């Protein structure tokens, strides 16, 4: 078995600006993280990783 991980950063000014203008940024960053995780799983299934055997 193996494990995955990633993260992102955000600031108070950006949070307030998103809440004011109607479009946030944390939602987009979380969507990007989830999509990256899913593509990593698919790439692991179909292409493997020689150093990880």
């Amino acid at each position: 078995v193996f494990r995955l991980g990633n993260a992102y950063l955000i600031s108070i000014d950006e949070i307030k600006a998103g809440q004011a203008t109607g479009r946030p940024l944390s939602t987009r960053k979380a969507s990007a993280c989830q999509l990256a995780h899913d593509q990593l799983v698919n790439r692991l299934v179909f292409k493997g990783s020689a150093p990880h055997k």
Partner: protein, 150 residues
């Protein structure tokens, strides 16, 4: 405003709770023992491939002890590995007596400390105890101290 000390002095573990950094996205080629220096042989997809220190290499970090990742007793080929890149850590040594405080250490083959007269690099931190008819020393690892030769 002070820094706490850490309890068990075994090789391969951290000795203080000062500023430290652990690079956990790595894989091993060959076998590595806890408390030895490692070098970076290549990079694949944001992952660093590490091996035990040869002659002529530049050390990058020190293998770190974990009780879930390494159930055998050492790090095995094809395993995800923890490497300490910044902080104070207990290292295996072949020396006989403690060197001068804040001197410059030198690494023999296999990632063991054998010199205390280097020009630049990691420094001795003042800890010197005994393990298994051999000794353990305390090293202070810094991030950009050793630079790969062009």
């Amino acid at each position: 405003y002070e820094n706490l000390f850490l309890r068990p002095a075994c090789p391969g573990n951290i000795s203080d709770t000062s500023t430290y950094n652990i690079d956990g996205a790595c894989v091993a080629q060959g076998d590595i023992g806890f408390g030895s220096a490692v070098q970076v042989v290549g990079i694949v997809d944001g992952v660093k491939v590490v091996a035990a220190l040869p002659d002529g290499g530049t050390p990058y970090g020190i293998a770190f002890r974990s009780q879930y990742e390494h159930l055998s007793g050492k790090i095995l080929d094809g395993e995800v590995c923890n490497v300490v890149s910044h902080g104070r850590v207990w290292t295996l040594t072949s020396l006989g007596e403690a060197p001068s405080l804040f001197s410059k250490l030198q690494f023999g083959s296999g990632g063991v400390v054998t010199g205390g007269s280097g020009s630049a690099g990691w420094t001795f931190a003042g800890g010197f105890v005994k393990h298994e008819d051999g000794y353990i020393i305390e090293v202070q690892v810094k991030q950009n101290a050793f630079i790969a030769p062009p």
